[PDB]
Ligand binder design. Structure first.
Ligand code: BIV
Ligand code: BIV
Lengths: 10, 239, 239, 10
């Protein structure tokens, strides 16, 4: 999923 | 000869982006869980690494061409190259003087030993210090250091990447600027470019060696529970 | 009348278990990420709560009959009642004197406001302070306080539980000891038992209200990333 | 899964 990384890459 | 505007505008971008994501005074390190000398340094270093992953992401977003990649490929490159970028940027706090990353008084001064109380054999920490020392000795201009990080982050050869041809292109362009720059601005740098590229290889080894160590650490819940959500994600394989 | 040995041996166990899992000096609170007055208190309180979840688990393991339950039911009770137990045990640091949990100097003194910079409306924090004040006023003997926590942790009515009849039994026995004790040892406690049971109900409301708030917080990755692996698990619904 | 909780409950 990578919920965090997605949000951080805007 | 002399650089073109496009290349130069890339330098501006990376050098500025790095300045924006790297505090030479390490003032935020007090927001981490304090260090402690079974893996007492783990809580601290987990926070240090997590803090940095966030910073590496900020630097990557401002790398030209990078944000125009698919979330997947960005994430792909971030996941696989993260630990590497952390090792490079860390150099600016490293110190041949006392063989350690000095980011504060006794507290934020990281000796080889500290990384041991964080779940890492001494035999693996050895190649790290060798890398740090070697890299540091190349006395890179900030423009070369910031380039080297962009090149590394754009290595097309990363498990998970898709458009390996577009990443290949971006990295090739960054590689040009580095060569072109070392030529026009760096004296005695006739063999530096080669040395810098060599550094990337070493990063690969260090990268892999870390993977194995972090893999064990993570499979043990009493230890993985010490890590942060972001770290668990970037280094986890839920991919 | 007077207590039997079995019941008394239960008191010994809970009172001792609690002593073993609760430091009246809050000395470990410095291993947490420092507090900070968008949700600056979150990193700290996440560590506080996570620290406590670990402690609640230590206390539960020593609750008679509890460890002879299936991992599932233990985990079931832990997941659902955790936040409640945290609210009860917290009372010992609460203070009608200044309406707040005092666990240190300015730093570890938690005002209602601090929990706001952690992702919680003021309108929901209100019922908490009312509970803390009410509970604190019952001036419970340590034997009654430690019992009340065991009873709460053994509520058969928890989503996820299976052998709700065995949990029902254990809790019933703990409920006896509490009543029997308040009778033989607590003066003017003719109506205390009823009051203590009432407290459990309130915990339920507070429990639910927290669920809703934590649910929102968690669905936002820039915030859930602040939490700890243990908290994400105990309060997450991957069940 | 509850990997952490399991380990903590021994
Ligand atoms: C972070 C930064 C700094 C230093 C870097 C360090 C010192 C402590 C240990 C680290 C973080 C190395 C660790 C990774 C440990 C993390 C974990 C989760 C416990 O597996 C090494 C792994 C590499 C080998 C091959 C030695 O196993 C990599 C770089 C080292 C300070 C500042 O320069 C910002 C920079 O941004
Ligand atoms: C921990 C302990 C202490 C205090 C408890 C507090 C003060 C800070 C905020 C807390 C932790 C309340 C919070 C939960 C916040 C966590 C999170 C992840 C940010 O959703 C409240 C939720 C309840 C309402 C209904 C108000 O929304 C519950 C108990 C409160 C100190 C010591 O007594 C040990 C004890 O062991």
């Amino acid at each position: 999923k990578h919920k965090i990384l997605h949000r951080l890459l805007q | 000869h002399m650089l073109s505007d496009e290349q130069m505008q890339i330098i501006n971008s990376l050098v500025e982006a790095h300045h924006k994501t790297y505090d030479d005074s390490y003032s935020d390190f007090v927001r981490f869980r304090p260090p402690v000398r079974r893996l007492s340094m783990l809580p601290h270093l987990a926070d240090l690494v997590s803090y940095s992953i966030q910073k590496v992401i900020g630097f990557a977003k401002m790398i030209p061409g990078f944000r125009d990649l698919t979330a997947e490929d960005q994430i792909a490159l971030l996941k696989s190259s993260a630990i590497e970028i952390i090792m490079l940027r860390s150099n600016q706090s490293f110190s041949l003087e006392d063989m350690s990353w000095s980011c504060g008084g006794p507290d934020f001064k990281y000796c080889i030993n500290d990384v041991t109380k964080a779940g890492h054999t001494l035999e693996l920490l050895e190649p790290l210090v060798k890398f740090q020392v070697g890299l540091k000795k190349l006395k890179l201009h900030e423009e070369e250091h910031v380039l080297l990080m962009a090149i590394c982050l754009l290595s097309p050869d990363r498990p998970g990447v898709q458009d390996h041809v577009r990443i290949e292109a971006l990295q090739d362009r960054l590689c040009d600027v580095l060569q072109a720059y070392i030529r026009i601005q760096h004296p005695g740098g006739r063999l530096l470019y080669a040395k810098m590229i060599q550094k990337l290889a070493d990063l690969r080894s260090l990268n892999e060696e870390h993977s194995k160590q972090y893999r064990s650490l993570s499979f043990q819940p009493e230890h993985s529970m010490q890590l942060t959500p972001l770290v668990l994600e970037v280094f986890g394989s839920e991919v």
